[model samples]
Target: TFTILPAVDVVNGQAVRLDQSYGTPLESALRWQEQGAEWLHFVDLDAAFNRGSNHELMAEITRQLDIKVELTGGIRDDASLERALATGATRVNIGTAALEKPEWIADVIRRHGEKIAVDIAVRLENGEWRTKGNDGGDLWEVLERLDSQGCSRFVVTDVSKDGTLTGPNVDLLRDVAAATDAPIVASGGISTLEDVLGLAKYQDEGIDSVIIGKALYEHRFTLAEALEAVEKLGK
Candidate 1:
């Protein structure tokens, strides 16, 4: 069965949504825990954009909650990486660093293995991979290197579909899955139970999990309902 993860993006100590508004990460995270969320995708927007830090808040959540935390945003070096891991996160996601620093990332992947997941926000400009998109040469080649370096998972996001809720970029996801055996944690553009069901179909194709944010906050569907829907589909 595919793992269904709910996301909480934090900026300046408050959990912010796609609308740029704020919610309490503690409360929202607690609620998701009650709703049976096994994992929570926690993002630090301030740290990601180099504005500030929310390490304390994230630490509290991880220390208090039983649900696993997939910590993301602005993890660039050894210091930042250690701090994030100290928060008790199950995994730390690196994006910009992967593009800028190869030796560092390779070492992290070598030591941490699956505990570190790379976020591949594969951007396209007229069908070509965005020049500034993530790391390495091509998307396929990056995956190949990461896979060979003992990396076992990835969080793949489609920038265009992100926050729009139009639907997931199924084609992009399928292509990435076929390119690597790393278990993908699908991110962005998930808007409904149908979207969840659609992604569940690719579980065996290397899409083993998904992260839903706006859809749950907007009441499109509850986490419990989505879980039930996928459960009914059977393994």
Candidate 2:
């Protein structure tokens, strides 16, 4: 299935990102739910930036929402992972550590199953696909190893177009799809309804979902319109 997950970047317990500040995480979260979102891409930006975290607030929001959430940011250790998992997010994404601590990633994948999602944060530096993690430069190798470890999912992001309002990186997604059989979720650069429907064509390749951010907050298109467009994209 092709799914769109509205992104809520939480900083200081409020939803914000890329010059587009919404409201409290709960308020923005509820609004998306009302618009019929099935999943939410919730990131603790504060934690990731080392500016303290809204960890407790995340639990509160998750407890109140009816939709699934894929939580990301600052979950690199056992303590943070425990706290993040306690928030009851549908799945937790781990970056940096997936490369810094491969053994632990494998262990967690074995222990938690599909609840763990590895962030495939990559960059097209010098025309080569490299990772933004600690030092994992070979993305293809990492994907293969992660897949073999039963890693639940790959949340792929091309850091170049991450916050840019360009469009989703189709070639990158296609290359990633060709590299691994594991399910993937795209996160970055969704600027229009065409991007949404454009990404829809990838569902058969195992890239089943997208984490849409700035474009939604910027009001380039309504979530309902994108949803309905993609819904009809299948027909």
Best by TM-score: 2
- For model 2, residues 1-235, the per-residue Cα lDDT tens digits are 3998998888877886333344688888878888889899889998888899888998998788778988998998888899889999899999888888989988888889889989878887777788887778688888888988888689888887866667878888988888887888988778778888888888999889988887887778888888888889788
Q: How accurate is candidate 2 locally (lDDT)?
A: 0.84
lDDT by residue for model 1 over 41-106, one digit each (tens)? Answer: 999998889898899999998888888899998899999998888888898899868867878889
What lDDT score belongs to each candidate, Candidate 1 first? 0.83, 0.84
Give the range where candidate 2 is weakest over 10 consecutive residues by summed lDDT.
14-23
The TM-score between candidate 1 and the true structure equals: 0.91
- Relative to the unseen true structure, what is the C-alpha lDDT of residue 190 in candidate 1, on a scale of 0 to 100? 81
Regions of model 1 farther than 4 Å from truth: 16-23, 130-136, 163-165
Kindly give the stretch of ten consecutive residues in candidate 1 with the minimal lDDT sum.
Answer: 128-137
